[PDB]
RNA sequence: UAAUAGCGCCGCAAUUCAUGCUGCUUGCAGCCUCUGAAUUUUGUUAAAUGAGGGUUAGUUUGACUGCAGUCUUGCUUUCUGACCCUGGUAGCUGCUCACCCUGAUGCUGCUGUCAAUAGACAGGAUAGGUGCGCUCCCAGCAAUAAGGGCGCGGAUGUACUGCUGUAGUGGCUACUGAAUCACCCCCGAUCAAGGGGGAACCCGGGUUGAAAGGAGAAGUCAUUUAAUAA
C-alpha cells in the first residue's frame, strides 16, 4: 500500500479542495496508483497468488466508481479517464 | 496384460537442452491442431453424433503445417507424435461425449414410461389388476429380456397397453401384487429428473485443451486490465477468468509408437544406451535399479537378436512396445533442462517375458495378421500387405527367452472379490460343483502385516484435508494427500487376492460390476435432501456431505483395474456378476462367485 | 481452575460361531488352545494405536541357468528406523483494523530460567482436554467467517476498505544455518564415483529392518478456498 506522504500527495492534486476527504475522483485517481504499483511486482513474482487475489479485488472497484461516475457527470468521467492515462 | 517400466535418461547439457528446444516448439502445433479443429472444422458436429474421428483428419491438417515457418524445423517423427498426440485427445472425448449422449436418451426414455399405479389406471382406462395380467402375457410372449421389453415399449404401443410393459419394467422385469406408497414413487421419479437434469448439464464439456508454455495470452490480458476499463460486468469477469488461470510449465511428451524408432547400446564404460529415430546424434544414458534392469538389457538383446539374423525376426515379438518420453517435474531454480528430468516410459507386453507367453502373442498376432489380409483383399494398399505378410512370415522365427510352464487353473474354483465403502476388499473362494467355500479372507487377513494402513489412509485422508482447509485460507502453496497410500494399499490387496487365487488353484477372480455408483448416490441423496430441506438449497447440499464426499472418495475403479493387472500377469481369468445388495461382505463375495459361475452358459 | 458430553479410531474383556481348532459320518458331535468374523462391554505403571516440520542415486522385495551357480543399475511410490531443526537480514507485495455486541471448519496452548512489561536465553516433539485424535470441549484473544449497533468528515444519480493507520498476519524472490543417513567413522562425485580405515556377533567368510509398479493424453465429477455478480 502507499506511503503516507504518497497518499496526502495524490487526494491533494485529484481532490477539489484539501477537504474533499473521498470524492470518486480521489477514490479512482488512488486505486490507479496502487494498481500501478501491483502490475510491476505482479509481473516478475509470477508465483505470488496471494497478490492477484489483491489485485483482481482493486481493479474490481475502480470499474465501480468510474461507472457510477460516468452517469453522475460525464465532465468529471473525462477529465478524470484523461489525468489517469487509462483507456 | 501390458505394464509400463522407466529410467531416467541422462545426458550433458548441450544434448538435454537441444531436446528441450525441440518440445517447446513441438509443444506449440499441438496446440495450433486442437484449434483446427475445436473451431476451424466446418464437419465436427458430425463427428459429435458418430462418436468417432475420422482416422486420416488429423494428419491432414498437420501435413500442410509441416512447412510453416513456426513449425517447420523439427524430425518427421516428432510430428507423427504430435499427430498421436492430437489424434488420441480427439478419439478419447468425442467417445466421452457420445456415451453421455446415449445416457440421455437411454433415461429420457424412462422418465416418460414411469407412472404411477394410478396414472397406468388412468392412461389404460383400465385396472391395476388388468394390467398385471398383461404383464403376465408381455413375460409369457418374451419366455436379452430388459432390452426385448423396452423395445416392446419402443415398438408395439398396442392402445396404451405398453403401460403393463412399464409396469414389468418398473418392476425389475417381474410381477408384482403390492401397490405403491405415493411418497416412494415420488422420490424414485424424482431420482430420475435428477439423473436427466445432470445429463443435460454434462452434455456440454470444455472443448479439449492445449497447453500454452508461453504466457502470451496471460501477460497481454494484465496489461489490458490495469490500463483499460471494461464496457460490461461480463468482460470485465473475461478478464478475471483469464487472469486466474494457472498456465502449464511442461511440453506435451514425445510418443514413439514403433518400437524399432528406440535403437539400444552399450556404452563404453558398461551402461546402457538410447537413441531415437531423427535425433541420432543425441545419445542418452540409461538410469534404473536393478529391480526393473533386466527389461533394459533385453531390449538390447531383443535388437541385437534381430540384426545379428538379417531381420529375419520381428518386432512384432519385440518385448518393448512404445515409449513415452517426457520431462518430469524438478525443483527449486535453473534452466528447464537443467531443472526437469527427461524419463522414458516403455510400454512392454508382460507375456513376451517367457517363450511359453510369446508363443501366446505369435498366435494372436497370427490369427489378426490373417483375418486383416483378408479383409483387405490399390497400390499403396499392397505396398501395406508387403510389410504385412513379411510379419505373417517372420513372426514364426523365434528369439531365444526365459522357459516357464504356464499358470493353470481349476474351471470350477472361482475367487469372489466384494468392494464396499467400510470393507474395501474382502474375498471367498468358492469350490461351485460342490457348492462349498474352501476359504474366506477379510481385511485383517487379506493384507496381514500391513492392516495399520487402513487406519492410516483414514487418519491421513481426514488430518490433510482439514491442513488442506487451513492452508488454503492463508495462500499457502503446501497441499497434499493421501492418493500414494491408496494406490499403495490397493496394490497390497491386488497381490494378496491373486496369491490367494494361486494358492488354491482357482480358475478365475471374480469382480463386481459395480458400474457409476459416484452419480447414483448423488441423485438419490439430493431426491431425499429436497424432501426434508425444500426451497432451502444450500441445506440441501449440506445434508449427508460426509456419505457423498466418500463415496467420491472410494476407489473401486483403481482397486478393480490394480487386481485386473496382477491377475493377466498371473494368467488368471477375469470373470464379472452382479453384486447382492444384501448379506455379509462374505455372503456378497459368495454369492457374486457363484453368480458368475452360473453365467458360464 | 476448567474440559463433564458428542463423534472417529486403538486394543483390552467377554458372549455368540468358523473361514479355525480333535475325530471319522467327509458333515456331523465337540469345545475356544490358536487363527478369524459378529455384537456388547472397557479406559485399569493392561495392552494397542498413536499427524510438531525436514534429511540418503539407503537396504530388502530382482533376472537367468539346475534350493546351487552366474549376472545386477542408481526408475516411480508406501512404511519402519535413525539423525537434524523449532531459524537468520535484504527487498517486493496481498489482506485486516474509527469505536462496540454476538464469536467463526478462526488464531494461540511443551519443559526450565530471567523478566514477571511481551519478550529474551537454554532444552525439545511427551506439546490445552481422555488410552489416542477431531471442525467437538475448556481457557485467553478475536479486525482479518458472518450479522447487527453506530460517531465525525469526503462523496451522495445506484459507486463507495471510501476517512479516521502502524502495526498484526500471510505470499514471493535472492543469499544463508543443521541433518545430505540404513551398524558407526572419514574423504569425495550429484545428467554420477566411488574409495579407505574400525567396532559387535555367528560358523575368513557372512550377518548387523522390510514392501509394491501399466504408463501417457483428454473430458467429467465431488469438496474447498478465492474472485465477480443479483
Redesign the interface.
Same mark, same amino acid.
Given at each position: 500500500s502507499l506511503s503516507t506522504e504518497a497518499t496526502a500527495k495524490i487526494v491533494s492534486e485529484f481532490g477539489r479542495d484539501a477537504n474533499d476527504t473521498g470524492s470518486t475522483e480521489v477514490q479512482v485517481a488512488l486505486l490507479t496508483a496502487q494498481i500501478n504499483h501491483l502490475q510491476g511486482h505482479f509481473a516478475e513474482h509470477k508465483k505470488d497468488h496471494h497478490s492477484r487475489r489483491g489485485l483482481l479485488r482493486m481493479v474490481s472497484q475502480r470499474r465501480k466508481l468510474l461507472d457510477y461516475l460516468k452517469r453522475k457527470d460525464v465532465a468529471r468521467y473525462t477529465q478524470l479517464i484523461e489525468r489517469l492515462g487509462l483507456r | 496384460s501390458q505394464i509400463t517400466i522407466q529410467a531416467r535418461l541422462i545426458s550433458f547439457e548441450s544434448n538435454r537442452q537441444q531436446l528441450w528446444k525441440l518440445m517447446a516448439d513441438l509443444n506449440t502445433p499441438l496446440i495450433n491442431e486442437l484449434l483446427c479443429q475445436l473451431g476451424q472444422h466446418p464437419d465436427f458436429e458430425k463427428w459429435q453424433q458418430k462418436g468417432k474421428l475420422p482416422s486420416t483428419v488429423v494428419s491432414q491438417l498437420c501435413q500442410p503445417l509441416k512447412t510453416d515457418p513456426r513449425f517447420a524445423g523439427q524430425p518427421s517423427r516428432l510430428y507423427m507424435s504430435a499427430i498421436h498426440i492430437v489424434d488420441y485427445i480427439y478419439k478419447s472425448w468425442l467417445a466421452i461425449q457420445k456415451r453421455l449422449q446415449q445416457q440421455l436418451d437411454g433415461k429420457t426414455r424412462w422418465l416418460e414410461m414411469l407412472n404411477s399405479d394410478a396414472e397406468l389406471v388412468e392412461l389404460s382406462g383400465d385396472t391395476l389388476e388388468a394390467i398385471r395380467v398383461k404383464a403376465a402375457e408381455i413375460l409369457a410372449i418374451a419366455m436379452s429380456l430388459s432390452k426385448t421389453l423396452f423395445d416392446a415399449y419402443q415398438e408395439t404401443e398396442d392402445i396404451k397397453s405398453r403401460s403393463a410393459i412399464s409396469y414389468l419394467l418398473k418392476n425389475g422385469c417381474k410381477l408384482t401384487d403390492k401397490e405403491e406408497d405415493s411418497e416412494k414413487f415420488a422420490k424414485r421419479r424424482r431420482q430420475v429428473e435428477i439423473q436427466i437434469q445432470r445429463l443435460t448439464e454434462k452434455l456440454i464439456s470444455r472443448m479439449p485443451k492445449g497447453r500454452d508454455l508461453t504466457?502470451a495470452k496471460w $501477460?497481454e490480458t *494484465? *496489461?489490458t #486490465?490495469?490500463?483499460?476499463? #471494461?464496457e460490461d460486468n461480463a468482460q #470485465?469477469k473475461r478478464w478475471?477468468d483469464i $487472469? $486466474?488461470t494457472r498456465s502449464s510449465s511442461l511440453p506435451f511428451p514425445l510418443v514413439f509408437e514403433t518400437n524399432e524408432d528406440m535403437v539400444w547400446s552399450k556404452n563404453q564404460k558398461g551402461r546402457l544406451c538410447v537413441h531415437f529415430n531423427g535425433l541420432s546424434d543425441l545419445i542418452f544414458e540409461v538410469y534404473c535399479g536393478n529391480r526393473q534392469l533386466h527389461w533394459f538389457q533385453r531390449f538390447l538383446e531383443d535388437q541385437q537378436t534381430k540384426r545379428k539374423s538379417k531381420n529375419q525376426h520381428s518386432s512384432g515379438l519385440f518385448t518393448l512396445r512404445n515409449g513415452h518420453l517426457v520431462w518430469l517435474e524438478g525443483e527449486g531454480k535453473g534452466e528447464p533442462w537443467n531443472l526437469h528430468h527427461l524419463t522414458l516410459y516403455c510400454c512392454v507386453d508382460n507375456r513376451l517375458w517367457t517363450e511359453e507367453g510369446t508363443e501366446i502373442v505369435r498366435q494372436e498376432k497370427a490369427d489378426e495378421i490373417t483375418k486383416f489380409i483378408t479383409n483387405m483383399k490399390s497400390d499403396t494398399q499392397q505396398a501395406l500387405i508387403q510389410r504385412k505378410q513379411s510379419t505373417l512370415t517372420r513372426i514364426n522365427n523365434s528369439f531365444e527367452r526365459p522357459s516357464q510352464p504356464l499358470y493353470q487353473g481349476q474351471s470350477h474354483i472361482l475367487v469372489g472379490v466384494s468392494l464396499g465403502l467400510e470393507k474395501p476388499a474382502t474375498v471367498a473362494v468358492v469350490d461351485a460343483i460342490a457348492n462349498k467355500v474352501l476359504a474366506y479372507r477379510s481385511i485383517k487377513q487379506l493384507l496381514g502385516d500391513n492392516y495399520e494402513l487402513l487406519n492410516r489412509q483414514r487418519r491421513q485422508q481426514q488430518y490433510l484435508s482439514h491442513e488442506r482447509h487451513k492452508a488454503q485460507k492463508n495462500?499457502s502453496?503446501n497441499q497434499f494427500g493421501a492418493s500414494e497410500l491408496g494406490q499403495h494399499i490397493d496394490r497390497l490387496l491386488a497381490k494378496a487376492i491373486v496369491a490367494l487365487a494361486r494358492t488354491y488353484k482357482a480358475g478365475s477372480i471374480v469382480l463386481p460390476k459395480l458400474g457409476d455408483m459416484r452419480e447414483v448416490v448423488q441423485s438419490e441423496i439430493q431426491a431425499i435432501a429436497e424432501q426434508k430441506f425444500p426451497g432451502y438449497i444450500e441445506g440441501q447440499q449440506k445434508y449427508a456431505k460426509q456419505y457423498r464426499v466418500n463415496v467420491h472418495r472410494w476407489s473401486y475403479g483403481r482397486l478393480i483395474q490394480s487386481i485386473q493387472s496382477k491377475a493377466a500377469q498371473t494368467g488368471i481369468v477375469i470373470e464379472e456378476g452382479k453384486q447382492p445388495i444384501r448379506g455379509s461382505p462374505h455372503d456378497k463375495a459368495k454369492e457374486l462367485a457363484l453368480s458368475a459361475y452360473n453365467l458360464r452358459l
Open positions: - | 504466457n $501477460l *494484465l *496489461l #486490465a490495469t490500463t483499460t476499463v #471494461a #470485465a478475471q $487472469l $486466474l495462500f502453496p
